[PDB]
RNA sequence: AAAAUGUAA
RNA sequence: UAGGGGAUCGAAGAUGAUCAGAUACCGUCGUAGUCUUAACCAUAAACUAUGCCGACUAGGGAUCGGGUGGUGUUUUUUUAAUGACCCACUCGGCACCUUACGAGAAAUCAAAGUCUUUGGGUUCUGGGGGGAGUAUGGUCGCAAGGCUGAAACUUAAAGGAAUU
């Protein structure tokens, strides 16, 4: 989204679903962003160290936010085993 | 009205004019 | 019966993105459907596929992302005359900057702009975006 | 008909929840108690407030009252929350089946095995 | 005399967010009308038409007033104001308040070129309502807003210039014609386009970092 | 219905009305001069910013 | 990311067996819940205790990840977990709403029940279907303690519990507080017994 | 319009049934599309029961019962019988109570 | 398909049913049937002439209550006696 | 069990 | 149509009451008929008012037929063996429950979904309502009727779902 002389034209930049690659728009009142704080030594989650996860409004309308939850959580290292891809 | 009665009306009316056309043969 | 095999593979794919699938499965697959999977893959619409080999027709499990929205077919196989390409872009293509109409030519299964450089023509397959 | 309305239950409720450390089952004191804390308009009106609360005082002396409290009873609730004085882990250890026997065999420890019969 | 409520309303009365783009960015909803005005001073009006809606009673009748008003400006901001009040005057004032609670941004670029300044639309989008489908097609500069008299002045206060429209069904109805257009422009940002196929960091919410000052008293 | 009614009123009300004529009214220019007076008498010095617009108001 | 010693523990797991939180459901088993450790015959199932610790420690990363620890709603439909939700907001500082929920606690800012949350918690996702729609119109995280029967409609995290009642509700919220302090709080290590009593939670008669 | 997915009372899987006769007016009604209730009562009333064990012999006697099945025609079950109709969502109820 | 043949060689099938469905038109029917060339007081014309047969007084219907004040005509190219409507206020004194 | 009807206001 | 049979109910008809009238609704008798043999007639709110095949989008339980497992039970003479039932699973099914992000005028329907993000293959019909499924010819039929199927003229409504 630009023009002949470069520059970023057309205001406003919407988000996107990290589980469905489906853009997050404002008319969705059912999309939830997760804020998982990254803990280190002696615990301490840190007030500014979080991991964001995109789970759209349609995902909640079916209850599938739990499937890609284990999916998106397992590969980053917060879920020791638990879920299995190969089924 | 009931169209079952409208089909009984025309039924006898066609049969009536059928024997009247046979009076010319 | 089973007439257009390409239209059936796209069938399971239409409702696949309507749910948010990360995978799909086609059947029974032909040579034509193979070169079309490479068309979307070539521009970055879908991902890579894996054709499972069996002693029948065949099956392909394509791993899709979420960039693809609508994948359809144009039945039957229509005759194009170079002028049909510049009219069909306004026949169903969402934009004038993006979108590809793939068809069948003698030199291979490609789109209108690639067939533009080589002035090639033949029949028609489907639409992509 | 002769039934209490909105302003009756409403007003009788306010007085009892903020001035409970008083009151009795007497009419001449509960009536003059309405005259010592708040302000009214007429007498007949004031008489109805007092009569409905002597009715409520009789149900408060019998334990719990439906819809009313003042924090004093939440502490009273903690006292009578411990019953039993005997217990109902005493009889044997674990009463199971043949199917529940294979269950302990896969994950547990302080849960022994005992077989039954069952007819499906 | 504004003084709102919630963390959302107090972080706007504090001046931590002067852009309405932050609202639409995190998909967060609206609750107060006066908040959308502290972020959008240039909001203009345009009343379409009022049609008295009647209801029967054990005695006779009792008609109200169905005022169809819209808001927004020449940029990308529009408002949907549906109101049913006792009087025509009350339906005008309270109908504008409702139009603020339903504000949404619109997408439109060029017909097929890339020069400068979005003139036309982006893609083929549509919105339905009851039995009225309204498709939006991109048009070249120099043309005009091609549609009905009502949907024409609607897109005028939408910020767009060139457009085409094709309907199917019963369209003589102001409500469903314009309610389906409110849907067509809402789907402008609901269809994946190549020039927007890069992954975004998806920033942390303002009411998270500013959730320290707007909590309580 | 009635196939044969009464035709005594062929131009009844037409002539039973009073006789009033047209006086010689002020001259109005033709063409370009005429549209010059519409441009001012509706936009420039306007008509009346009372509610909306009137070219044929009331008795006030 | 992984902590340090927040892995598999013999003491933590044997206390979950004294809670009966490993007992499964019956004829019912909702599709999205294939978290079993052997199918128990006679119409029953089993719950993986290691994968259940995972659910509790994850949603807890979202608990202490909220700015002010007071805007956390602790809803309870079950009378069995009413004193349990009162003790959770009593150690962190959140807001408990046990008993009557009332439509207008997330919406309708005119009432004294309305509170703007950043994290929501539910006991029984079946009967609390009203608190489910509340958060689904304002963009806020939803937690639910399901078994195998309760449908996970509009929820983010669905932990495998025992909503049947008994002592299962008081066991869950007990370890939830011990975790909001282990990671940024008044906690120290793993060899920490915690002075608090679990028999203060649970249902007490009458 | 159509208010019941069964129209009257079931008709899926066959497409024809033998019509029986109403017991009150005796109007021919389809087998499955008719109403029949259990009349699992006693021989007498709740009073003349001890009067029987008074005149009869044997120890305490026995006391018999009588079962029956009443067939109606919808018009009969409403005149003052098994009906009282229902509301929109309450019509879909399938429990005896 | 949805009720139709997308057949390359079934071009005539589409042509067959099309003509039969055109007969359902009130405008197409009257056009190719030459309705004016048969009956209709106007045989291919928009203007015609007749002769006054007599002076009538036909009235109106609902939701009204009044008279129409009419007359009678007669085709020259045909010979068919007809009836016409007299416009304006009166002017029956100029017909005859 | 029986118990119909409605002039331009 | 022609034979046989022909209890019962019962178009017609008869008849006592019923109504102002009663050739209806109520009672009673009873011709054809209701059954079968050989020919016909070929229309039904003949409906799931939903044509035929093909694929996918849903959580689950019932339930008929075949199938596979279970150191499950019943039969006992005896471990048996089958047969019966239970539970897991499965195709062809007969339907249902809660939703449907979908579609739909609405009611609603896992189809009436995959329809402006417009095409799997294919059949037949309607194009405001009347007039009128009427006319003429034709055509099958013993007849009744069936099949195909108009015109003149008329009118701004007919109509469908749903809220008060």
Task: Furnish the topology, listing elements before pairings.
The structure is cut from a larger assembly and holds nine protein chains of nine kinds.
Chain F: H1 12-15, H2 32-40
Chain G: H1 10-15, H2 49-59, E1 72-76, H3 82-88, E2 95-98, E3 119-122, H4 129-135, E4 142-146, E5 157-160, H5 168-182
Parallel strand pairs in G: 1-2, 1-3, 3-4, 4-5
Chain I: H1 11-22, H2 26-32, E1 70-74, E2 81-85
Antiparallel strand pairs in I: 1-2
The structure holds two RNA strands.
List keywords for this structure.
part of a larger assembly; 9 chains; C: 129 residues; alpha+beta; Ribosomal Protein S8, Chain: A, domain 1; Dna Ligase, domain 1; 2 domains; 4-stranded antiparallel sheet; 6 strands; 19% strand; globular; D: 120 residues; mainly alpha; Diphtheria Toxin Repressor, domain 2; 6 helices; RNA-binding
Write a structural description.
With 25 residues, chain B is mainly alpha-helical. Helices cover 68% and strands 0% of the residues of chain B. With 217 residues, chain E is an alpha+beta fold. In chain E, the strands form two sheets. Chain E has a four-stranded antiparallel sheet with strand order 1-2-3-4. In chain E, a hairpin with a 4-residue loop joins strand 2 (65-72) and strand 3 (77-85). Chain E is flat. Chain I has helices at residues 11-22, 26-32; strands at 70-74, 81-85. The longest helix of chain I has 12 residues, at 11-22. Chains A and G meet through strand 3 and helix 2 of A and helix 2 of G. Chain C binds two RNA strands through residues 1-5, 7-9, 11-16, 18-19, 27, 69-70, 72-76, 92, 94, 127, 129. Chain F: This is Small ribosomal subunit protein eS30A.
């Amino acid at each position: 989204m630009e023009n002949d002389k470069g520059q970023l034209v057309e205001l406003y930049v919407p988000r996107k679903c990290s589980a469905t690659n489906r853009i997050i728009k404002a008319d969705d009142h059912a999309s939830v962003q997760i804020n998982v704080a990254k803990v280190d030594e002696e615990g301490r989650a840190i007030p500014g160290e979080y991991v964001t996860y995109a789970l759209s409004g349609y995902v909640r309308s079916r209850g599938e936010s739990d499937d890609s939850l284990n999916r998106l959580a397992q590969n980053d290292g917060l879920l020791k085993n638990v879920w299995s891809y190969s089924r | 009205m009931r169209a079952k009665w409208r089909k009984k009306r025309t039924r006898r009316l066609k049969r009536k004019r059928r024997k009247v056309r046979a009076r010319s043969k | 019966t089973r007439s257009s095999v390409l239209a059936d593979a796209l069938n399971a794919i239409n409702n696949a993105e309507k749910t948010g699938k990360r995978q799909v499965l086609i059947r029974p697959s032909s040579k034509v459907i193979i070169k079309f999977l490479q068309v979307m893959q070539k521009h970055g619409y879908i991902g890579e596929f894996e054709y499972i080999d069996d002693h029948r027709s065949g099956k392909i499990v394509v791993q899709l992302n979420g960039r693809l929205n609508k994948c359809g077919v144009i039945s039957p196989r229509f005759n194009v005359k170079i002028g049909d390409i510049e009219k069909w872009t306004a026949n169903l293509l969402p934009a004038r900057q993006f979108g590809y109409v793939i068809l069948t030519t003698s030199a291979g299964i490609m789109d209108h702009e690639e067939a533009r450089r080589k002035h090639v023509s033949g029949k028609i397959l489907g639409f992509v975006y | 008909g002769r039934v209490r309305t909105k302003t009756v239950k409403r007003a009788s409720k306010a007085l009892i929840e903020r001035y409970y450390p008083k009151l009795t089952l007497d009419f001449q004191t509960n009536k003059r108690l309405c005259d010592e804390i708040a302000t009214i308009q007429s007498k007949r009106l004031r008489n109805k407030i007092a009569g409905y609360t002597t009715h409520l005082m009789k149900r408060i002396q019998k334990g719990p009252v439906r819809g009313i409290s003042f924090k004093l009873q939440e502490e009273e609730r903690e006292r009578k929350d411990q019953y039993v004085p005997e217990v109902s882990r005493s009889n044997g250890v674990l009463n199971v089946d043949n199917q529940t026997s294979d269950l302990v065999k896969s994950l547990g420890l302080k849960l022994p095995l005992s077989v039954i019969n069952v007819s499906a | 005399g504004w003084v709102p409520v919630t963390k959302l309303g107090r972080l706007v009365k504090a001046g931590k967010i002067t852009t309405i783009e932050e609202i639409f960015l995190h998909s967060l909803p609206v609750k107060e009308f006066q908040i959308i005005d502290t972020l959008l001073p240039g909001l203009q009006d345009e009343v379409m038409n009022i049609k008295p809606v009647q209801k029967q009673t054990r005695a006779g009748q009792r008609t109200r007033f169905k005022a169809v008003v819209v808001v927004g400006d020449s940029n990308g901001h529009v408002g949907l104001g549906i109101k049913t009040a006792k009087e025509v005057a009350g339906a005008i004032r309270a109908g504008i308040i409702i139009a603020k609670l339903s504000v949404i941004p619109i997408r439109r670029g060029y017909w097929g070129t890339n020069l400068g300044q979005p003139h036309s639309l982006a893609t083929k989008t549509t919105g339905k309502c009851g039995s009225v489908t309204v498709r939006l097609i991109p048009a070249p500069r120099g043309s005009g807003i091609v549609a009905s008299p009502a949907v024409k002045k609607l897109l005028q206060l939408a910020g767009v210039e060139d457009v085409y429209t094709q309907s199917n069904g019963k369209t003589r109805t102001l409500e469903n014609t314009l309610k389906a257009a409110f849907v067509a422009i809402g789907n402008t940002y609901g269809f994946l386009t190549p020039n927007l196929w890069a992954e975004q960091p998806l920033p942390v919410s303002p009411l998270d970092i500013y959730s320290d000052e707007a909590s309580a008293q | 219905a009635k196939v044969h009614g009464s035709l005594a009123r062929a131009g009844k009300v037409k002539s039973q009305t009073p006789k009033v004529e047209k006086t010689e009214k002020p001259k109005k220019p033709k063409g370009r001069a005429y549209k010059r007076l519409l441009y001012t008498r509706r936009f420039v010095n306007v008509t009346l910013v009372n509610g909306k617009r009137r070219m044929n108001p009331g008795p006030s | 990311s992984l902590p340090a010693t927040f892995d598999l523990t013999p003491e933590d797991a044997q206390l979950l067996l004294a809670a009966n939180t490993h007992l499964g459901a019956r004829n019912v088993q909702v599709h999205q819940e294939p978290y079993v450790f052997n199918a128990r015959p006679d119409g029953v199932h089993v719950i993986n205790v290691g994968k259940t610790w995972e659910k509790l420690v994850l949603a807890a990363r979202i608990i202490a990840a909220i700015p002010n620890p007071e805007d956390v709603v602790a809803i309870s439909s079950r009378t069995f977990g009413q004193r349990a939700v009162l003790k959770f907001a009593a150690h962190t500082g959140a807001t408990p709403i046990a008993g009557r929920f009332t439509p207008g606690s997330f919406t309708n800012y005119i009432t004294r029940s309305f509170k703007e949350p950043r994290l929501v918690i539910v006991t029984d996702p079946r009967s609390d279907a009203q608190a489910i729609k509340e958060a689904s119109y304002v963009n806020i995280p939803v937690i639910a303690l399901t078994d195998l029967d309760s449908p996970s409609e509009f929820v983010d995290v669905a932990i495998p519990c025992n909503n049947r009642g008994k002592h299962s509700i008081g066991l869950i919220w007990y370890l939830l507080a011990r975790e909001v302090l282990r990671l940024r709080g008044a906690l120290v290590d793993r060899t920490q017994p915690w002075s608090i009593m679990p028999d203060l939670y649970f249902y007490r008669d009458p | 319009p159509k208010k019941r997915a069964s129209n009257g009372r079931n008709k899926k899987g066959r497409g024809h049934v033998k019509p029986v006769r109403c017991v009150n007016c005796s109007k021919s009604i389809p087998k499955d599309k008719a109403i029949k209730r259990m009349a699992i009562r006693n021989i007498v009333e709740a009073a003349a029961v001890r009067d029987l064990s008074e005149a009869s012999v044997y120890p305490e006697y026995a006391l018999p019962k009588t079962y029956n099945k009443l067939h109606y025609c919808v018009s009969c079950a409403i005149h003052a019988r098994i009906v009282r109709v229902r509301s929109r969502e309450d019509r879909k109820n399938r429990a005896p109570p | 398909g949805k009720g139709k043949p997308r057949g390359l060689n079934s071009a005539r099938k589409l042509r067959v049913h099309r003509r039969n469905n055109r007969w359902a038109e009130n405008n197409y029917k009257k056009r190719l049937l030459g309705t004016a060339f048969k009956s209709s007081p106007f045989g291919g014309s928009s203007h015609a002439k007749g002769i006054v047969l007599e002076k009538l007084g036909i009235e109106s219907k609902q939701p009204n209550s009044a008279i129409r004040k009419c007359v009678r005509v007669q085709l020259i190219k045909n010979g068919k006696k007809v009836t016409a409507f007299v416009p304006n206020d009166g002017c029956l004194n100029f017909v005859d």
